[PDB]
Design an enzyme around this catalytic site. Structure first.
Site, mmCIF file in Angstrom:
data_model
loop_
_atom_site.group_PDB
_atom_site.id
_atom_site.type_symbol
_atom_site.label_atom_id
_atom_site.label_comp_id
_atom_site.label_asym_id
_atom_site.label_seq_id
_atom_site.Cartn_x
_atom_site.Cartn_y
_atom_site.Cartn_z
ATOM 1 N N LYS A 115 0.780 -1.235 0.000
ATOM 2 C CA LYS A 115 0.000 0.000 0.000
ATOM 3 C C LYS A 115 0.830 1.314 0.000
ATOM 4 O O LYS A 115 0.461 2.291 -0.714
ATOM 5 C CB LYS A 115 -1.079 -0.020 1.100
ATOM 6 N N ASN A 138 -1.972 6.878 6.333
ATOM 7 C CA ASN A 138 -1.312 5.900 7.173
ATOM 8 C C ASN A 138 0.212 5.993 7.050
ATOM 9 O O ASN A 138 0.944 5.347 7.803
ATOM 10 C CB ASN A 138 -1.814 4.509 6.817
ATOM 11 N N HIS A 183 -2.532 -8.252 11.800
ATOM 12 C CA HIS A 183 -3.337 -7.554 12.777
ATOM 13 C C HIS A 183 -4.336 -8.474 13.504
ATOM 14 O O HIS A 183 -5.344 -7.995 13.993
ATOM 15 C CB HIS A 183 -4.125 -6.432 12.080
HETATM 16 C C1 LIG Z 1 -4.893 5.739 22.584
HETATM 17 C C2 LIG Z 1 -4.436 4.377 22.109
HETATM 18 C C3 LIG Z 1 -2.970 4.434 21.695
HETATM 19 C C4 LIG Z 1 -2.544 3.048 21.206
HETATM 20 C C5 LIG Z 1 -1.050 3.066 20.861
HETATM 21 O O1 LIG Z 1 -0.909 3.954 19.746
HETATM 22 C C6 LIG Z 1 -0.987 3.370 18.503
HETATM 23 C C7 LIG Z 1 -1.331 4.150 17.390
HETATM 24 C C8 LIG Z 1 -1.340 3.552 16.111
HETATM 25 C C9 LIG Z 1 -1.000 2.192 15.939
HETATM 26 C C10 LIG Z 1 -0.976 1.617 14.662
HETATM 27 C C11 LIG Z 1 -0.624 0.264 14.502
HETATM 28 S S1 LIG Z 1 -0.564 -0.519 12.976
HETATM 29 O O2 LIG Z 1 -0.940 -1.917 13.127
HETATM 30 O O3 LIG Z 1 -1.468 0.119 11.970
HETATM 31 N N1 LIG Z 1 0.950 -0.422 12.410
HETATM 32 C C12 LIG Z 1 1.900 -1.423 12.934
HETATM 33 C C13 LIG Z 1 3.339 -0.926 12.687
HETATM 34 C C14 LIG Z 1 4.363 -1.930 13.215
HETATM 35 C C15 LIG Z 1 5.775 -1.384 13.171
HETATM 36 O O4 LIG Z 1 5.927 -0.210 12.772
HETATM 37 O O5 LIG Z 1 6.698 -2.155 13.525
HETATM 38 C C16 LIG Z 1 1.606 -2.795 12.308
HETATM 39 O O6 LIG Z 1 1.218 -2.795 11.122
HETATM 40 O O7 LIG Z 1 1.754 -3.842 13.003
HETATM 41 C C17 LIG Z 1 -0.321 -0.467 15.646
HETATM 42 C C18 LIG Z 1 -0.336 0.085 16.922
HETATM 43 C C19 LIG Z 1 -0.667 1.427 17.066
HETATM 44 C C20 LIG Z 1 -0.668 2.009 18.339
#
Ligand SMILES: CCCCCOc1ccc2cc(S(=O)(=O)N[C@H](CCC(=O)O)C(=O)O)ccc2c1
Length: 429
Positions: A115, A138, A183
């Site tokens: 993406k 994103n 995910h």
């Molecule tokens: C108030 C709640 C806060 C939670 C913690 O903050 C966050 C904000 C955005 C996220 C996006 C994503 S995410 O899943 O969209 N991106 C990660 C990136 C992994 C990496 O860079 O190694 C993934 O694809 O696994 C996961 C966790 C997140 C946590």
């Protein structure tokens, strides 16, 4: 939309949370922000006039709100958000806010893999057309930061999480490039639920671009594929559109079948957006790639050190390995937060006498198990590397394509990729 007088609560800081805060302040609304982390990023960049609650969610704030803006990082399934949805309190994301304001067509791209590449390519295709284009979402800048009425086109990468809180998107062109397990920590109802989130991107889309080689990407839609599809490949390899050649891939700086299918998807999207084809094809020859996305950070003494930190799932790592050519031994680094993903699919690429595994982070052990006879397991990636460097011979490849998130030991996949580049330069000479 009009938010005046409304009691607004933003869940999650960081750049996104801040972009949301600035969004409301500028519109004369002072929101309250909460983050489950004790010290979320950006905390110090948050205006003092903005009340904040960190270290957990505040149900008194949540249940009192007229509007809850939730970061993609928090699950709507969370009991606190769940209780508020039951109470009839409106919940949205930054992408929803953006859609309600955008005054330009939006190309929306999602998928388990590719993406950012495709989103960046469409951005590149608009720049070559002389179109003022906002590229982000994103990746890059949070959507709300791209908002400018002088903007003529927006290209946004959207995750399944972001899509989950979006409902007002009417993309001129939208796509799901593919759906492979990822995910799962956020989708307790399996692959189909995960897919269900991605499918939301097609709703109200003027044109849908599907992947003819992946049935899960389908809701007619314009399609792209390897041997079939409105946009397809021809074999030397050519990008074809309905039978007509449009580009010999040798003119591309990017290689690999999946990057060619990416080129087709970008093209299908660019075309649907009305972008001139000539300039879109030019962009495909100038794009060099994204950092951390199968990036050679050092090629010295007959040894390539590739940084594919952006491989944060099995499908991605699989793309790097499928058809991978290595003269000597592949020293593959895996590890981090696997997110409950099934790693089995990797195994079929892990046979032979020319493979070494260096598994670290939270799921290291689980990753070593793919083939314990050729695997080493450390706690960190730096240990894994200082461990493999001595064994690196001319002809070898050191590949960081962990198949996992890095959030367990790193801020993000970019940090992990940058630490890998520094280490590689150190040990690669
Ligand atoms: C108030 C709640 C806060 C939670 C913690 O903050 C966050 C904000 C955005 C996220 C996006 C994503 S995410 O899943 O969209 N991106 C990660 C990136 C992994 C990496 O860079 O190694 C993934 O694809 O696994 C996961 C966790 C997140 C946590």
């Amino acid at each position: 939309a009009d938010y005046q007088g409304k009691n607004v609560v933003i869940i999650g800081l960081g750049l996104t949370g801040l972009s949301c805060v600035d969004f409301f302040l500028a519109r004369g609304v002072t929101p309250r922000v909460m983050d489950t982390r004790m010290t979320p990023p950006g905390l110090d960049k948050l205006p003092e006039a903005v009340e904040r609650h960190t270290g957990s969610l505040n149900d008194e704030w949540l249940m009192a709100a007229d509007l809850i803006v939730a970061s993609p990082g928090i699950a709507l399934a969370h009991p606190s958000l769940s209780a508020a949805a039951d109470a009839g309190i409106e919940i949205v994301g930054d992408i929803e806010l953006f859609c309600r304001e955008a005054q330009a067509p939006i190309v929306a791209i999602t998928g388990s893999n590719g993406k950012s590449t495709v989103t960046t390519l469409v951005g590149e295709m608009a720049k070559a057309a002389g179109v003022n284009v906002g590229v982000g979402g994103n990746i890059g800048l949070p959507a709300l930061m791209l908002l400018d009425d002088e903007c003529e086109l927006y290209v946004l990468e959207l995750s399944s999480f972001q899509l989950e809180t979006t409902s007002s998107l009417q993309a001129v062109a939208a796509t799901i490039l593919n759906v492979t397990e990822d995910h799962m920590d956020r989708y307790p109802f399996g692959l189909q639920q995960y897919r269900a989130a991605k499918l939301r991107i097609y709703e109200n889309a003027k044109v849908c671009v599907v992947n003819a080689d992946d049935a899960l990407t389908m809701p007619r839609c314009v399609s792209f594929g390897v041997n079939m599809g409105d946009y397809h490949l021809n074999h030397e390899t050519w990008l074809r559109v309905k039978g007509e050649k449009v580009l010999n891939v040798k003119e591309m700086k990017l290689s690999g079948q999946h990057n060619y299918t990416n080129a087709l998807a970008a093209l299908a999207l660019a075309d649907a957006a009305g972008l001139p084809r000539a300039s879109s094809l030019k962009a495909l020859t100038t794009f060099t790639g994204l950092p951390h996305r199968f990036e050679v950070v050092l090629e010295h003494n007959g040894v390539r050190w590739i940084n594919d930190s952006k491989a944060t799932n099995v499908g991605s790592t699989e793309a790097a390995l499928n058809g991978l050519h290595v003269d000597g031994t592949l020293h593959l680094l895996l590890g981090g937060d696997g997110k409950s993903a099934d790693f089995s699919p990797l195994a079929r690429y892990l046979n032979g006498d020319n493979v070494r595994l260096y598994c670290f982070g939270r799921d290291g052990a689980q990753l070593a198990a793919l083939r314990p006879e050729v695997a080493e397991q450390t706690e960190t990636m730096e240990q894994a590397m200082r461990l493999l460097a001595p064994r690196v011979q001319p002809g070898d490849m050191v590949l960081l394509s962990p198949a996992c998130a890095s959030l367990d030991q790193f801020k993000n996949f970019e940090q992990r990729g940058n630490e890998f580049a520094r280490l590689a330069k150190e040990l690669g000479s």
